[PDB]
Design an enzyme around this catalytic site. Structure first.
Site, PDB file in Angstrom:
ATOM      1  N   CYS A 167       5.879  -0.013  -9.073  1.00  0.00           N
ATOM      2  CA  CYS A 167       6.278   0.775  -7.912  1.00  0.00           C
ATOM      3  C   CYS A 167       7.775   0.775  -7.670  1.00  0.00           C
ATOM      4  O   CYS A 167       8.227   1.456  -6.745  1.00  0.00           O
ATOM      5  CB  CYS A 167       5.645   0.227  -6.625  1.00  0.00           C
ATOM      6  SG  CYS A 167       3.987  -0.345  -6.726  1.00  0.00           S
ATOM      7  N   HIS A 304       9.623   1.458   1.623  1.00  0.00           N
ATOM      8  CA  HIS A 304       8.582   1.483   0.599  1.00  0.00           C
ATOM      9  C   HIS A 304       7.265   1.975   1.196  1.00  0.00           C
ATOM     10  O   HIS A 304       6.660   2.931   0.691  1.00  0.00           O
ATOM     11  CB  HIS A 304       8.423   0.103  -0.020  1.00  0.00           C
ATOM     12  CG  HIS A 304       7.560   0.098  -1.241  1.00  0.00           C
ATOM     13  ND1 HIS A 304       7.733   0.998  -2.276  1.00  0.00           N
ATOM     14  CD2 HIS A 304       6.516  -0.687  -1.593  1.00  0.00           C
ATOM     15  CE1 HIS A 304       6.835   0.756  -3.214  1.00  0.00           C
ATOM     16  NE2 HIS A 304       6.084  -0.260  -2.822  1.00  0.00           N
ATOM     17  N   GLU A 315       7.150  -5.731   4.857  1.00  0.00           N
ATOM     18  CA  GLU A 315       8.388  -4.950   4.812  1.00  0.00           C
ATOM     19  C   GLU A 315       9.011  -4.837   6.195  1.00  0.00           C
ATOM     20  O   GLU A 315      10.242  -4.873   6.335  1.00  0.00           O
ATOM     21  CB  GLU A 315       8.143  -3.543   4.242  1.00  0.00           C
ATOM     22  CG  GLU A 315       9.451  -2.723   4.061  1.00  0.00           C
ATOM     23  CD  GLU A 315       9.239  -1.360   3.409  1.00  0.00           C
ATOM     24  OE1 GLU A 315       8.067  -0.955   3.256  1.00  0.00           O
ATOM     25  OE2 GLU A 315      10.245  -0.719   2.999  1.00  0.00           O
ATOM     26  N   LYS A 336       5.533   8.411   2.125  1.00  0.00           N
ATOM     27  CA  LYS A 336       4.330   8.358   1.305  1.00  0.00           C
ATOM     28  C   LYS A 336       3.098   8.892   2.022  1.00  0.00           C
ATOM     29  O   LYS A 336       2.088   9.167   1.364  1.00  0.00           O
ATOM     30  CB  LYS A 336       4.091   6.937   0.804  1.00  0.00           C
ATOM     31  CG  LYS A 336       5.160   6.474  -0.226  1.00  0.00           C
ATOM     32  CD  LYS A 336       4.776   5.114  -0.822  1.00  0.00           C
ATOM     33  CE  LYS A 336       5.767   4.666  -1.901  1.00  0.00           C
ATOM     34  NZ  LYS A 336       7.145   4.600  -1.359  1.00  0.00           N
ATOM     35  N   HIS A 341       1.752   7.751  -2.738  1.00  0.00           N
ATOM     36  CA  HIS A 341       2.515   6.733  -3.453  1.00  0.00           C
ATOM     37  C   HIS A 341       2.562   7.144  -4.920  1.00  0.00           C
ATOM     38  O   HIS A 341       1.552   7.076  -5.631  1.00  0.00           O
ATOM     39  CB  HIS A 341       1.901   5.350  -3.226  1.00  0.00           C
ATOM     40  CG  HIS A 341       2.589   4.234  -3.959  1.00  0.00           C
ATOM     41  ND1 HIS A 341       3.868   4.345  -4.461  1.00  0.00           N
ATOM     42  CD2 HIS A 341       2.242   2.932  -4.111  1.00  0.00           C
ATOM     43  CE1 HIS A 341       4.240   3.186  -4.977  1.00  0.00           C
ATOM     44  NE2 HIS A 341       3.268   2.313  -4.782  1.00  0.00           N
ATOM     45  N   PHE A 400       4.441  -4.024  -7.784  1.00  0.00           N
ATOM     46  CA  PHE A 400       3.545  -5.050  -8.300  1.00  0.00           C
ATOM     47  C   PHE A 400       4.283  -5.965  -9.264  1.00  0.00           C
ATOM     48  O   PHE A 400       5.187  -5.541  -9.994  1.00  0.00           O
ATOM     49  CB  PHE A 400       2.337  -4.418  -8.998  1.00  0.00           C
ATOM     50  CG  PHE A 400       1.426  -3.688  -8.061  1.00  0.00           C
ATOM     51  CD1 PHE A 400       0.440  -4.366  -7.359  1.00  0.00           C
ATOM     52  CD2 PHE A 400       1.581  -2.324  -7.849  1.00  0.00           C
ATOM     53  CE1 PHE A 400      -0.397  -3.692  -6.475  1.00  0.00           C
ATOM     54  CE2 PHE A 400       0.749  -1.636  -6.966  1.00  0.00           C
ATOM     55  CZ  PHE A 400      -0.240  -2.325  -6.277  1.00  0.00           C
TER      56      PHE A 400
HETATM   57 RB    RB Z   1      11.764   4.156  -0.560  1.00  0.00          RB
END
Ligand code: RB
Ligand code: RB
Lengths: 412, 409
Positions: A167, A304, A315, A336, A341, A400
């Site tokens: 990711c 993220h 986060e 996202k 994602h 990951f």
């Molecule tokens: Rb981002």
């Protein structure tokens, strides 16, 4: 220290075939998540994804080479043609000028590459024997074939590098190109993150590790970063591309500059292979070093924010810690919700989204903000875009394996 | 510029489970290529590979973790354990000291990662519906995921996936990271294990593999007239890189010092190397120009295909000026096969120990000279010669090229 600027950008995702159409839809809070059509997902526990439904690969390759590239590479060719045209570098034959080719490279990122091609050829071999494996299997599936096909497309012969940190691959692809230019290994670098893994073993694989939302009844409501009812990410496909260029090279040729690279940070959690670290401790360090590198006031963070329980929580804690306080965190949004994602493509897509937000003074929203989560209490720009001028933007990627990458771009 | 030294090394391949045993066998000119037994290849057009037959996964992992880690990660854990132990950095719990952890990262390379795990789960979804393995077990960057947890190293965690050059680019990206002060130390590992039906079948269908099934030990023969494709091998190589002052401060032992690198793209064709090795030439030139040393030994890419070995030999001649000006060259892919993304890491270890020992390992199966490949390839027997610097080439699918040069401590 060599300065580095952005002179071209492009992207393709489930809300648009180019960056103008895509960013508009994203800022308006649209959603490209749909029921899966690219395979028969009717019996799967997850039946939704951010599929691109209007992509024609014969616009970017002849129908004979289409079979030689996995879909992720086809998307990369589309996004990079957009970015390379945008940069003005290309000559009368849409190629980098020959006297400049040795000093422009390519940095490509993808988490998994041609998963569907590996799948299909695995079944061919299993059932019918190895001579049924396509001659073009290997070229279609390897992650670095993004760089293979794109270097040939534009005649760019500099360092040809690929990133595969799950990711975070799209953000590390930016950073590795930055390092290359900083160290004088190139004067320009094409950067592209690209992913297309919406296939049975892809959806099944992320569903079996319990990483995906199973909210199949309302696809457009399934991806909801930081919302209290988030329950897993939604796989999307797409590609984002940027042309990075040394500062003097850009100004001397009169190229329009969209942003200047300001800082980056890289770290590993060294905690768990799939769960992010408590308190977002690795994300904190990557964020901290990017901020200390850039020495600017960040006005917008593209998080993220994958819409999993733990990622969004950890986060949010890391953001509060790195900025010093809730009130000191700039406006944050994860896009996202809108495009899903996109895994290795996420960082490259979201760098483009972030720089366009700065250019237009429009911060895109986090969508599907319906139930506040007391533990995720920052400003996530809920549901509608915010008109706000910003002078620098931060983009986070926490993938990951505990691998973290953060980039900061500033106004030019 | 910040200086960078190699303070620990390790490797596992089809000729040994550690760097001492495998280098000895490589220098003696042995061959770890065997008939394939890790799957039923009886009806395959290619039935040979550099299989590691004596690797015990349980030494580096628990049984619950084989679902979580493909074989390539298991080999990476073995080689990195060797290298980190060799480095002396590890504390009483075989972990990096907490006070150094934030400044030590990992750079991992692989071309394809857990191919066989993807294959198994693809087959199983097709037959039984929506598993033998976790999709995590196959992602290339899980080398860095598992190894960073294993040693507790928290610095930049980067991965390289440039096919046959991945192991060399993994070295280079770690170098760049240290030069730019993003780390003081980096664990580097290239790892590959793709000896599976679809992996053999994919390289066979593109006509890249030797079909000399009758003589496994004679099939991989770089620069020889009768070469006819590469032989898949599996393995992993690992290096610990440390900034010079950091290393002296802690009393590290020093195997070699980073001297230079070069990176380029052919931008010619997706599988065919460029004529005259034009991109390889440029990568080699920039490494030599950066390093400013006399290279005494070159570990060639030398995969034993027709066009790679030819074009690499032309590029070598062009970069050094003439046949007689090229340093002694050898490819060690005769001995252990083409280990793909692992090859560059393995061959950096091989090259550094060659320098340390003054033993230049040979190119084996040198039986019929090819007039077009007319360099000194150290044929069949190792050469006793002291060298001050070594160069290692990696020229991968997609036209991606990487070269690194190490010099004497
Ligand atoms: Rb981002
Ligand atoms: Rb080599």
């Amino acid at each position: 220290m060599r300065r580095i600027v952005v002179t071209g950008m492009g992207m393709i995702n489930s809300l648009g075939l180019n960056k103008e159409d895509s960013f508009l839809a994203i800022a308006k809070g649209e959603c490209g998540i749909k029921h899966i059509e690219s395979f028969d997902a009717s019996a799967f526990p997850v039946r939704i994804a951010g599929e691109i439904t209007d992509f024609d690969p014969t616009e970017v390759m002849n129908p004979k080479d289409v079979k030689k590239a996995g879909r992720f590479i086809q998307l990369a060719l589309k996004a990079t043609r957009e970015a390379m045209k945008d940069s003005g570098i290309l000559d009368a034959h849409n190629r980098c000028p020959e006297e400049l080719a040795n000093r422009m490279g390519v940095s490509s990122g993808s988490g998994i590459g041609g998963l569907g091609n590996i799948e299909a050829n695995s079944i061919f071999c299993f059932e019918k024997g190895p001579r049924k494996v396509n001659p073009f299997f290997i070229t279609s599936a390897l992650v670095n074939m993004i760089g293979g096909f794109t270097s040939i497309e534009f005649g760019i012969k500099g360092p040809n590098l690929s990133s595969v940190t799950a990711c975070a691959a799209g953000t590390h692809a930016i950073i590795e190109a930055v390092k290359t230019i900083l160290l004088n290994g190139a004067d320009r670098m094409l950067v592209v993150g690209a992913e297309s893994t919406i296939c049975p073993v892809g959806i099944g694989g992320f569903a079996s590790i319990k990483a995906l939302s199973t909210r199949n009844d309302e696809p457009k409501k399934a991806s909801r970063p930081f919302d209290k009812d988030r329950n897993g990410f939604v796989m999307g496909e797409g590609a984002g591309a940027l042309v990075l260029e040394e500062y003097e090279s850009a100004k001397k040729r009169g190229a329009k500059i969209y942003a200047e690279f300001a800082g980056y940070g890289e770290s590993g959690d060294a905690n768990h292979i799939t769960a992010p670290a408590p308190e977002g401790e690795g994300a904190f360090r990557a964020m901290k070093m990017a901020l200390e590198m850039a020495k600017v006031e960040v006005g917008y963070v593209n998080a993220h924010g994958t819409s999993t329980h733990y990622n969004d929580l950890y986060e949010s804690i890391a953001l509060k810690n790195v900025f010093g306080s809730k009130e000191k965190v700039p406006p944050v949004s994860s896009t996202k919700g809108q495009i899903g994602h996109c895994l290795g493509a996420a960082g490259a897509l979201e760098a483009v989204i972030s720089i366009m937000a700065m250019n237009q003074g429009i911060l895109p929203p986090t969508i599907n903000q319906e139930t506040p989560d007391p533990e995720c209490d920052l400003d996530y720009i809920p549901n509608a875009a915010r008109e706000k001028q910003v002078d620098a933007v931060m983009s986070n990627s926490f993938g990951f394996g505990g691998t973290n990458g953060v980039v900061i771009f500033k106004k030019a």
